[PDB]
Structure formats: C-alpha cells, structure tokens
Ligand binder design. Structure first.
Ligand SMILES: *[C@@H]1O[C@H](CO)[C@@H](O[C@@H]2O[C@H](CO)[C@@H](O)[C@H](O)[C@H]2NC(C)=O)[C@H](O)[C@H]1NC(C)=O
Ligand SMILES: *[C@@H]1O[C@H](CO)[C@@H](O[C@@H]2O[C@H](CO)[C@@H](O)[C@H](O)[C@H]2NC(C)=O)[C@H](O)[C@H]1NC(C)=O
Ligand SMILES: *[C@@H]1O[C@H](CO)[C@@H](O[C@@H]2O[C@H](CO)[C@@H](O)[C@H](O)[C@H]2NC(C)=O)[C@H](O)[C@H]1NC(C)=O
Ligand SMILES: *[C@@H]1O[C@H](CO)[C@@H](O[C@@H]2O[C@H](CO)[C@@H](O)[C@H](O)[C@H]2NC(C)=O)[C@H](O)[C@H]1NC(C)=O
Ligand SMILES: *[C@@H]1O[C@H](CO)[C@@H](O[C@@H]2O[C@H](CO)[C@@H](O)[C@H](O)[C@H]2NC(C)=O)[C@H](O)[C@H]1NC(C)=O
Ligand SMILES: *[C@@H]1O[C@H](CO)[C@@H](O)[C@H](O)[C@H]1NC(C)=O
Lengths: 106, 50, 170
C-alpha cells in the first residue's frame, strides 16, 4: 500500500492536479542460508524463541531476529519453555545457557 | 514474440533450512496519484445559440 | 455498406471517434486491471519437486502436471463452471499465463512466506511460516508446533470441503 518492501515512512510532494508520494521502505538484502529447527531440546524440555528464530551456521546454534541476521546465545531470557521434547516434530538437541548460573556458581 | 512473465527463480525449499538477511537497502519509490481536474463550466445557452 | 448513409453520418461530426476512443479506453483498462491484479511478482517461482510441507497438502491448489493447461484442480473446476461492426479483442494475458502467475504467487507464499512480496524470496519451512502467522494473530509458536498434525489435517479437510462446495453449488 505504501511502496514495495517493508514500509518505513512516506513524504508528500505537490504536483499539478496531483500528489506524489515518496515511499521510504526497508528491503532485505544479502541473505544467507542457515540450518533451522522449530525448538531446542534441553533438560527434557522444549524451548521456543520469544521473538526470534533458531539458526545454525553448521556446528553451533543461535537465536536471531527474523528480519536481520544478529546471532545471540540461546539463553532462558530469549526463549520460553512449553512441554517436553516428545511432541514437537523436528526438535534438535542443544544446550540452553542460564544467566543466573555463574552468579550462584561463584 | 510470446511474452515472458518473469525471470525464472526456483526457491531452494527444504524442511530444515532458512534464509536470513544480513543487510538492508533503504529504497525510495514514487507513487503518482491524480487528485483534481480542471474546473470547467459551460454556458448552455451561449454554447448552443450564442 | 451504404455510401449515402455514411455521407449523411459525416454531417454529425466526430461522434464515432468519441465512441471508438471510449471503447478503446475500456479495452486497455481491462488489460490494465488484469495486469494490476495478477502481475504483482517479477520472479516466476516454482515449488520443490518433493512436496514435503510438514503434513500440509496443496495438491488441490498447485498446478496439475497431468493437465495440458497446467491448471490446479480448483482452477480447472472454476473454468469448467463458467459458461454488424462488432469485434472482440483477445485479452493481453492468456488463461495459461494468468494460471502461471497464480502458480508463481502460490509457490512464493508456500516456500518463502511473505518475504517475496517485500523483497528477495527467503526460504523458510512451512511449519515455521505457519508459526510466524500464528504469532501474527497473537497465538504462541508452541501451540502450532504441538498440534501440527491436527492443523494440517484440518487444513486439508477444509481445502477438500472447498472443492466439494464449489463442485456442488451452481
Ligand atoms: C559458528 O559460529 C560460532 C560463533 O562464532 C563459531 O565459533 C567460533 O569459531 C571461531 C573460529 O574457530 C573461534 O575462534 C571462536 O572461539 C568460536 N566461538 C565459540 C563461542 O565457540 C563457529 O566456528 C561457527 N561455525 C562455522 C562452521 O563457521
Ligand atoms: C536428544 O536427546 C535425547 C535425550 O537425551 C535422546 O533421546 C535418547 O535416545 C537414546 C537413543 O535413541 C535412547 O536410548 C534414550 O532412552 C533417549 N532418551 C529419552 C529421554 O528419550 C535423543 O536421541 C537425542 N537426539 C539426538 C539427535 O542426539
Ligand atoms: C542456499 O542453498 C541452496 C542449495 O544449496 C542454494 O540454491 C542453489 O542456488 C544455486 C545458485 O543459484 C543454483 O544453481 C542451485 O540450483 C540451487 N539449488 C537448488 C536446490 O535450488 C541457495 O542459493 C542458497 N542460498 C544462498 C543465499 O546462497
Ligand atoms: C551492507 O551493504 C552496504 C551497501 O549499502 C555496504 O556498504 C558498502 O561497503 C563497501 C565495502 O565495505 C563500500 O565500498 C561501499 O561504499 C559501502 N556503501 C555504502 C553506501 O556505504 C555494507 O558494507 C554492507 N554490510 C555488510 C555487513 O555486508
Ligand atoms: C494430497 O492430497 C491428494 C488429494 O487430496 C492425495 O491424492 C489422493 O491419494 C489417494 C491415495 O493414493 C488416492 O486414493 C486419491 O485418489 C488421490 N486423490 C487425487 C485427487 O489425486 C495425496 O495422496 C495427498 N498427499 C500427498 C503427499 O500428495
Ligand atoms: C526433514 O526430512 C528428512 C528426510 O528427507 C528427515 O530425515 C528430517 O528429520 C526432516 N527434518 C525436519 C525438521 O522435519
């Protein structure tokens, strides 16, 4: 409706008997392949991303936002737990870091 | 010739692979919309008979 | 073919030119309408040869290789169910190309989600695309993943009901 791509903002310009809209949009570019999974199995529990998607670069698993590649460590802060690992089809095994663990470890 | 609808592109779909963008382009596009016309009035008596 | 009639008709001026121009405008408008509705993608996408979509069946909407027209069963049913100076201009886009455009749109929305409409087509698994759509309407991803078989069965049943309803209602 407001340009091709993900719409950010628009500018109006007057024209004889008309209006010209300059649509400023965000277009994704330079995409890269990653290996993906619906959920991460840790401690017999299934972890799902709160806002992102699980990606793998070949050996390590990360969670990133859907529209830009920004890999982050899979923690309890960006994932939520629902159910065990027996129901979700395609769940893979990976560790889930806990931020609270070094605090009581030390 | 018979027209070509578009360039062929086969998306590499698989059950466990995703494509994530690593960059972006800020694209500005133009949309031209007419708003009004010339306001014309015709004197019917003058036009038909003068 | 009456010359006297044409000679008398010339006294009335450019009425014929106005009528022909109006009809020409309507005729180009129809092609513009078809171009706006169907030609919204510049890449012709195709589905993968293996139809593994996590239990989701799209046979009724994907093109049938057996048919010469390369139409879907639903599209074939739709085409079957529709039945002095005059000339009929052919449409600029044939039925095969319109079917090809719908096929490209279906392949893009199945294999790439909504990414192809906003930029390059980025592949994503269909049970992840459905989870994204579930998140769009305010339902968590886990609900989609846990009940994937039931949702796929319901979707297939609904598509079959759509084909039966179209075939059974005049
Ligand atoms: C996937 O990304 C991870 C994170 O960067 C990579 O792990 C790093 O690998 C480099 C190169 O060997 C090391 O110097 C770093 O110490 C590693 N970091 C961690 C946290 O282990 C990993 O190698 C990448 N995998 C591939 C196949 O490229
Ligand atoms: C992911 O981890 C689970 C649990 O550790 C693995 O499930 C085990 O699989 C072995 C061999 O198939 C069985 O003997 C165990 O009884 C299973 N444990 C449970 C709790 O079910 C699973 O195989 C792992 N997956 C991968 C790909 O390594
Ligand atoms: C992700 O991987 C797939 C498969 O490895 C790539 O798809 C191939 O792309 C090349 C280059 O256009 C084609 O010649 C192959 O035929 C494609 N394979 C299939 C199965 O379609 C895809 O290009 C990769 N994505 C990126 C961004 O590089
Ligand atoms: C993302 O794309 C932009 C293009 O807009 C890249 O910026 C270019 O980078 C090259 C090499 O670093 C320069 O020669 C160009 O002049 C840059 N263009 C502009 C407009 O600044 C950017 O480097 C890309 N980033 C990544 C991570 O790929
Ligand atoms: C997808 O759905 C189609 C049609 O709903 C299935 O095709 C049917 O398969 C059964 C079993 O062989 C046949 O008895 C029917 O006659 C088929 N119907 C049609 C219209 O061809 C198909 O098996 C389903 N699954 C896949 C993976 O394509
Ligand atoms: C993808 O399909 C392969 C078979 O081609 C199967 O072994 C694998 O488990 C599947 N992965 C997912 C996440 O469905």
């Amino acid at each position: 409706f407001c340009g091709k791509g993900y719409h950010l903002m628009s500018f109006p310009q007057s024209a004889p008997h008309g209006v010209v809209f300059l649509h400023v949009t965000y277009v994704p570019a330079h995409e890269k392949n990653f290996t993906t999974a619906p959920a991460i199995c840790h401690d017999g529990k299934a972890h799902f991303p709160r806002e992102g998607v699980f990606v793998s670069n070949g050996t390590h698993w990360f969670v990133t936002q859907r529209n830009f590649y920004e890999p982050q460590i899979i923690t309890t802060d960006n994932t939520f737990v629902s159910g065990n690992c027996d129901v979700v089809i395609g769940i893979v095994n990976n560790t889930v870091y806990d931020p609270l663990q070094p605090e009581l470890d030390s | 010739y018979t027209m070509s609808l578009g360039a062929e592109n086969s998306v590499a779909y698989s059950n466990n692979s995703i494509a994530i963008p690593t960059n972006f382009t800020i694209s500005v596009t133009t949309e031209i919309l007419p708003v009004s016309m010339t306001k014309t009035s015709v004197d019917c008596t003058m036009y038909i008979c003068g | 073919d009456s010359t006297e009639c044409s000679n008398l008709l010339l006294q009335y001026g450019s009425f014929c030119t106005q009528l022909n121009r109006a009809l020409t405008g309507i005729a180009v408008e129809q092609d513009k309408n078809t171009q706006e509705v169907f030609a919204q993608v510049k890449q012709i996408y195709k589905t993968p040869p293996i139809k593994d979509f996590g239990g989701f069946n799209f046979s009724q909407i994907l093109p049938d290789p057996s048919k010469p027209s390369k139409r879907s069963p639903i599209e074939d049913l739709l085409f079957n169910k529709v039945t002095n100076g005059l000339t009929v201009l052919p449409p600029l886009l044939t039925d095969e190309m319109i079917a090809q455009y719908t096929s490209a749109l279906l392949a893009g929305t199945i294999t790439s989600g909504w990414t192809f409409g906003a930029g390059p087509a980025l592949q994503i698994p269909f049970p992840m695309q459905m989870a994204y759509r579930f998140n769009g309407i305010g339902v968590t991803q886990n609900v989609l993943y846990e009940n994937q078989k039931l949702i796929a069965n319901q979707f297939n049943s609904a598509i079959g009901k759509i084909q039966d309803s179209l075939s059974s209602t005049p």
